[PDB]
Write a protein that holds these residues in place. Structure first.
Motif, PDB file in Angstrom:
ATOM      1  N   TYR A  87       2.247   1.383   6.335  1.00  0.00           N
ATOM      2  CA  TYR A  87       2.438   2.988   6.829  1.00  0.00           C
ATOM      3  C   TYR A  87       1.086   2.818   7.167  1.00  0.00           C
ATOM      4  O   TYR A  87       0.258   4.057   8.197  1.00  0.00           O
ATOM      5  CB  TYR A  87       3.148   4.184   7.153  1.00  0.00           C
ATOM      6  CG  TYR A  87       4.402   3.685   6.911  1.00  0.00           C
ATOM      7  CD1 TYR A  87       5.127   3.054   8.018  1.00  0.00           C
ATOM      8  CD2 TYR A  87       5.491   3.815   5.896  1.00  0.00           C
ATOM      9  CE1 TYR A  87       6.418   2.899   8.291  1.00  0.00           C
ATOM     10  CE2 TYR A  87       6.364   2.917   6.099  1.00  0.00           C
ATOM     11  CZ  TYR A  87       7.301   2.465   6.776  1.00  0.00           C
ATOM     12  OH  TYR A  87       8.203   2.055   6.771  1.00  0.00           O
ATOM     13  N   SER A  88      -0.424   2.527   6.861  1.00  0.00           N
ATOM     14  CA  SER A  88      -1.647   2.560   6.969  1.00  0.00           C
ATOM     15  C   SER A  88      -1.838   2.542   8.006  1.00  0.00           C
ATOM     16  O   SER A  88      -3.204   2.475   8.341  1.00  0.00           O
ATOM     17  CB  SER A  88      -2.551   1.754   5.512  1.00  0.00           C
ATOM     18  OG  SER A  88      -2.572   0.408   5.286  1.00  0.00           O
TER      19      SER A  88
ATOM     20  N   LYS B  73       0.983  -1.081   0.092  1.00  0.00           N
ATOM     21  CA  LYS B  73      -0.059  -0.098   0.260  1.00  0.00           C
ATOM     22  C   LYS B  73       0.571   1.366   0.081  1.00  0.00           C
ATOM     23  O   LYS B  73       1.410   1.019   0.995  1.00  0.00           O
ATOM     24  CB  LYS B  73      -1.101   0.324   1.154  1.00  0.00           C
ATOM     25  CG  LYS B  73      -2.307  -0.439   0.961  1.00  0.00           C
ATOM     26  CD  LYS B  73      -3.288  -0.287   1.823  1.00  0.00           C
ATOM     27  CE  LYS B  73      -4.652  -1.227   1.960  1.00  0.00           C
ATOM     28  NZ  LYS B  73      -5.182  -1.305   2.850  1.00  0.00           N
ATOM     29  N   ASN B  74       0.795   2.283  -0.554  1.00  0.00           N
ATOM     30  CA  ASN B  74       1.135   3.417  -0.963  1.00  0.00           C
ATOM     31  C   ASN B  74       2.638   3.135  -2.223  1.00  0.00           C
ATOM     32  O   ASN B  74       3.176   4.499  -1.047  1.00  0.00           O
ATOM     33  CB  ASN B  74       1.208   4.417   0.428  1.00  0.00           C
ATOM     34  CG  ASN B  74       1.261   6.079   0.323  1.00  0.00           C
ATOM     35  OD1 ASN B  74       0.944   6.178  -0.382  1.00  0.00           O
ATOM     36  ND2 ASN B  74       2.482   6.118   1.206  1.00  0.00           N
TER      37      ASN B  74
ATOM     38  N   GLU C 298       0.162  -3.637   4.309  1.00  0.00           N
ATOM     39  CA  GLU C 298      -0.378  -2.423   4.688  1.00  0.00           C
ATOM     40  C   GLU C 298       0.600  -1.422   5.056  1.00  0.00           C
ATOM     41  O   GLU C 298      -0.038  -0.377   4.665  1.00  0.00           O
ATOM     42  CB  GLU C 298      -1.452  -2.625   5.846  1.00  0.00           C
ATOM     43  CG  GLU C 298      -2.347  -3.654   5.849  1.00  0.00           C
ATOM     44  CD  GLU C 298      -3.410  -3.490   4.563  1.00  0.00           C
ATOM     45  OE1 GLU C 298      -3.569  -2.420   4.243  1.00  0.00           O
ATOM     46  OE2 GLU C 298      -3.955  -4.683   4.013  1.00  0.00           O
TER      47      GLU C 298
ATOM     48  N   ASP D   9       4.993   1.530   0.109  1.00  0.00           N
ATOM     49  CA  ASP D   9       5.995   1.975   1.387  1.00  0.00           C
ATOM     50  C   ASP D   9       6.927   0.911   1.448  1.00  0.00           C
ATOM     51  O   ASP D   9       6.577  -0.354   0.558  1.00  0.00           O
ATOM     52  CB  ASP D   9       4.666   1.428   2.303  1.00  0.00           C
ATOM     53  CG  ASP D   9       4.148   3.159   2.729  1.00  0.00           C
ATOM     54  OD1 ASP D   9       4.979   4.185   2.518  1.00  0.00           O
ATOM     55  OD2 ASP D   9       2.858   3.313   3.196  1.00  0.00           O
TER      56      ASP D   9
HETATM   57 NA    NA Z   1       0.405   2.624   3.248  1.00  0.00          NA
END
Ligand code: NA
Ligand code: NA
Ligand code: NA
Ligand code: NA
Ligand code: NA
Ligand code: NA
Ligand code: NA
Ligand code: NA
Ligand code: NA
Ligand code: NA
Ligand code: NA
Ligand code: NA
Ligand code: NA
Ligand code: NA
Ligand code: NA
Ligand code: NA
Ligand code: NA
Ligand code: NA
Ligand code: NA
Ligand code: NA
Ligand code: NA
Ligand code: NA
Length: 441
Positions: A406-407, A43-44, A404, A46
């Motif tokens: 840093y979410s 995610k993102n 996930e 990261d």
């Molecule tokens: Na994230």
């Protein structure tokens, strides 16, 4: 409702999730360094390249541990810091970091618990087959020997593996975690080699026999409940329990794989050498239990005849059901099935969407509620005969939550990843009080 005198209250982290310094001091690439470079996996976009910068900031984090009054701290050792490459040569800078960390723990009267493997396999081991290869068990034992020779007398509690089931499922069945394989047929082979590596590592530990030190393994569990009283649902729940919760426990304690495992993996016997179950089932000093949430199960007509039923509420930010009775039931079930062996809860905690207020404080009452219920359940288990020796909150710090990124924030300490500023959350303050009181209220 006080816990026993000497009960070990701690918090937990892992190396890839907090350390950063991913390419410093001769550290080699891990499968997680590689995995996080793959677009779309995290995610993102990261990575753990920096994370909590704990490799540099460990003294600050040691003082935070002291501020809370922790009796113990669970960390993992980055294998790739210790053996960066296929030469198998020891990297002294990497080893020195853990020496310094452990010295700092002792300076503050915090008992170290070290996890040897928390998923960050060195890429060189993956190049030699990773967990698919039987020889990786021997590599793991050589790594264990080096660490236990270096630090055995200074680390009173060692864990070989963290959550081998997750390595199997996320890493080889689903491809969601490193090394990202998606072949369900490989799970048995991988499980056996993880277990064999634990056994050979434990043999290395017994040979060194470090003064005052103990070794175990950490397993994750999801307490299974059927969605109804119907016989079919009860059966599905029993089968799911055997597989989800006893795949590893059965060979560890009883020296055999259970029937659910052999049916799931019907080629598993092909990887079992004549010694291998004896080695795998040699006595451990303690069991590490990781628990977050139960699973609710119903029967299905379609293969494999089991359906996991999702729960909408009450859940954490991960969508994981909050059910503290699941922890009580798990601990009692293990104790009744496998005997009253020493247990440490090596992870328990929750992710919620934490935000600093205008004054800069981070108030997380939902996380306090989670710990209140779960520590209460652990206390009941202890009262009812479970040999619970310690409890480690996941996590000391907000950190890199795998796919996930840093979410998701699991910390009792808030980390601003832009500035690396740490702030105790309400839950840290509350936990400090629990430790000081040796129990709830
Ligand atoms: Na994230
Ligand atoms: Na790192
Ligand atoms: Na990306
Ligand atoms: Na994406
Ligand atoms: Na990054
Ligand atoms: Na203290
Ligand atoms: Na010291
Ligand atoms: Na000291
Ligand atoms: Na290599
Ligand atoms: Na092999
Ligand atoms: Na190998
Ligand atoms: Na080696
Ligand atoms: Na031995
Ligand atoms: Na020996
Ligand atoms: Na039936
Ligand atoms: Na599963
Ligand atoms: Na034995
Ligand atoms: Na959670
Ligand atoms: Na949770
Ligand atoms: Na929330
Ligand atoms: Na994840
Ligand atoms: Na970051």
């Amino acid at each position: 409702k006080k816990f026993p005198e000497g009960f070990l209250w701690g918090a937990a982290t892992s190396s890839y999730q907090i350390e950063g310094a991913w390419n410093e001091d001769g550290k080699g690439e891990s499968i997680w360094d590689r995995f996080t470079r793959i677009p779309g996996k995290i995610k993102n976009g990261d990575s753990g390249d920096v994370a909590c910068d704990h490799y540099h900031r460990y003294e600050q984090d040691l003082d935070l541990m002291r501020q809370l009054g922790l009796k113990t701290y669970r960390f993992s050792i980055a294998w790739a810091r210790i053996q960066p490459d296929s030469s198998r040569q020891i990297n002294q800078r990497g080893l020195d970091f853990y020496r310094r960390l452990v010295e700092g723990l002792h300076k503050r009267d915090i008992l170290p618990m070290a996890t040897l493997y928390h998923w960050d396999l060195p890429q060189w081991v993956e190049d030699e087959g990773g967990w698919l290869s039987r020889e990786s068990a021997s590599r793991f034992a050589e790594y264990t020997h080096a660490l236990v020779a270096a630090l055995g007398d200074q680390i009173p509690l060692w864990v070989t593996h963290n959550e081998p089931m997750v390595t199997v499922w996320a890493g080889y069945h689903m491809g969601l975690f490193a090394p990202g394989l998606k072949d369900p047929t490989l799970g048995g082979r991988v499980a056996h080699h993880l277990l064999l590596s634990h056994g050979q590592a434990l043999q290395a530990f017994r040979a060194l026999s470090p003064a005052g030190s103990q070794m175990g393994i950490t397993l994750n569990f999801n307490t299974i409940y059927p969605v109804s009283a119907e016989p079919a649902d009860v059966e599905a729940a029993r089968r799911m329990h055997s597989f989800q919760n006893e795949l590893f426990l059965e060979p560890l304690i009883r020296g055999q794989y259970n029937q659910a495992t052999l049916m799931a993996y019907p080629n598993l016997p092909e990887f079992i050498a004549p010694e291998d179950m004896q080695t795998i089932s040699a006595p451990i000093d303690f069991l590490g239990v990781n628990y977050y949430n139960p699973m609710r199960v119903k029967s299905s007509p379609q293969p494999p005849g089991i359906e996991v039923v999702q729960v909408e509420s009450p859940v954490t930010a991960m969508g994981w059901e909050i059910a503290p009775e699941g922890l009580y039931d798990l601990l009692m079930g293990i104790t009744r099935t496998y005997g009253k062996l020493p247990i440490y809860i090596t992870e328990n905690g929750a992710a919620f969407d934490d935000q600093p207020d205008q004054s800069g404080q981070v108030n997380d009452p939902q996380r306090v509620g989670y710990f209140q219920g779960h520590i209460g359940a652990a206390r009941r288990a202890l009262a009812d005969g479970v040999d619970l020796r310690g409890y480690y909150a996941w996590s000391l710090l907000d950190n890199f939550e795998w796919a996930e990124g840093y979410s998701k924030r699991f910390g009792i300490i808030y980390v601003d990843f832009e500035t690396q500023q740490r702030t105790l959350k309400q839950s840290a303050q509350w936990y400090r009080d629990v430790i000081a009181n040796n129990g709830l209220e």
